[PDB]
Design a protein around this ligand. Structure first.
Ligand code: HEM
Ligand code: HEM
Length: 254
């Protein structure tokens, strides 16, 4: 009966995992998992939504990450009479259990969610969270934009800290353009980048041509880790696995 639009790759992946695949009629740009979701219509990007694109799908329920903007579009969609359910957007490993809970409560699959939660906690718990003296620089590369580093108050910065590592970039929030001096002062031991960032750059050649990268301990030892964009930053079900790659790569640097 329900025509569900899910917004937020984390939300979508959880809805699908709670067995609602059949009822989801559309989703946002950040939602690309599972692949089944890639075949659904794209209503736009979570951070720049427009009401018309969502309402054209005639949803009965909108499951939306709190990270969604502009907020008044949700108000507007709710006034039109669709059930708008908000999902917590904290970039924290403990936050995922909260996300699963809100989604399940909304789908009336409380028990299914409870099960999914235990599996996530069981997978998360297996990861060594002991702090390690390794500094990490996360870089986001587009095709047509200057490369950018993550400060604090980012998912990337939370991910790094949760793996037991340290954010090489300090003293600022969100993202900033790379500069040779900035990067070099950062002195990362490990360069963290996304799968798409790699494609945007070309080859490993261009990777170490990033401003100042070669003049860092990371660039000297070619210490690199490439992870799926949303797996790394989405704080959904794949969080434990990504923390594992990151932890392993750090431990292996002793
Ligand atoms: C017009 C298109 C886009 C614009 C203008 C844009 C802009 C931004 C900006 C400025 C930030 C960080 C600053 C802030 O949060 O205020 C950000 C974060 C992020 N973006 Fe977008 N973006 C776009 C498209 C996309 C798409 C298509 C994806 C699909 C995966 C995406 C995924 C993310 C994620 C996962 C973050 C969180 C990073 C973190 O917390 O470390 N973005 N985006
Ligand atoms: C940090 C993680 C981020 C991710 C995973 C991400 C992801 C994406 C993706 C998938 C696109 C679509 C690419 C395209 O259409 O060419 C995009 C576009 C865009 N992003 Fe990001 N983004 C991030 C951060 C940022 C930040 C911090 C900014 C700050 C300016 C930004 C600015 C933009 C802009 C202006 C576009 C639109 C380009 C166009 O329309 O041609 N993004 N982003």
């Amino acid at each position: 009966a329900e025509r569900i639009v899910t917004i937020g790759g984390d939300v979508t992946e959880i809805a699908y995992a709670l067995g609602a695949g059949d009822e989801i009629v559309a989703r946002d740009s950040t939602s690309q998992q599972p692949q089944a979701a890639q075949k659904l219509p794209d209503v736009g990007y979570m951070r720049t939504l427009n009401a018309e694109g969502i309402l054209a799908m005639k949803p009965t329920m909108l499951l939306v990450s709190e990270l969604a903007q502009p907020s008044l579009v949700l108000t507007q969609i709710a006034s039109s009479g669709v059930n708008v359910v908000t999902v917590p957007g904290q970039t924290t490993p403990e936050s995922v259990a909260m996300k699963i809970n809100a989604v399940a409560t909304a789908l009336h699959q409380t028990e299914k969610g409870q099960k999914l939660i235990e599996d996530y906690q069981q997978r998360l718990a297996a990861v060594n969270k002991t702090p390690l003296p390794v500094k990490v620089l996360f870089v986001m590369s587009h095709g047509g934009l200057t490369p950018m580093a993550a400060g604090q108050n980012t998912a990337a910065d939370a991910m790094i800290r949760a793996a037991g590592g340290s954010n090489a970039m300090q003293g600022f929030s969100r993202y900033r353009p790379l500069s040779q001096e900035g990067v070099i002062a950062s002195a990362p031991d490990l360069l963290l980048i996304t799968t798409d960032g790699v494609k945007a750059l070309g080859s490993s050649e261009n990777i170490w041509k990033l401003p100042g990268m070669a003049l860092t301990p990371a660039g000297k030892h070619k210490r690199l880790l490439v992870v799926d964009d949303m797996a790394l930053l989405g704080f959904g079900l794949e969080t434990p696995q990504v923390l594992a790659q990151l932890r392993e790569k750090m431990e292996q640097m002793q």
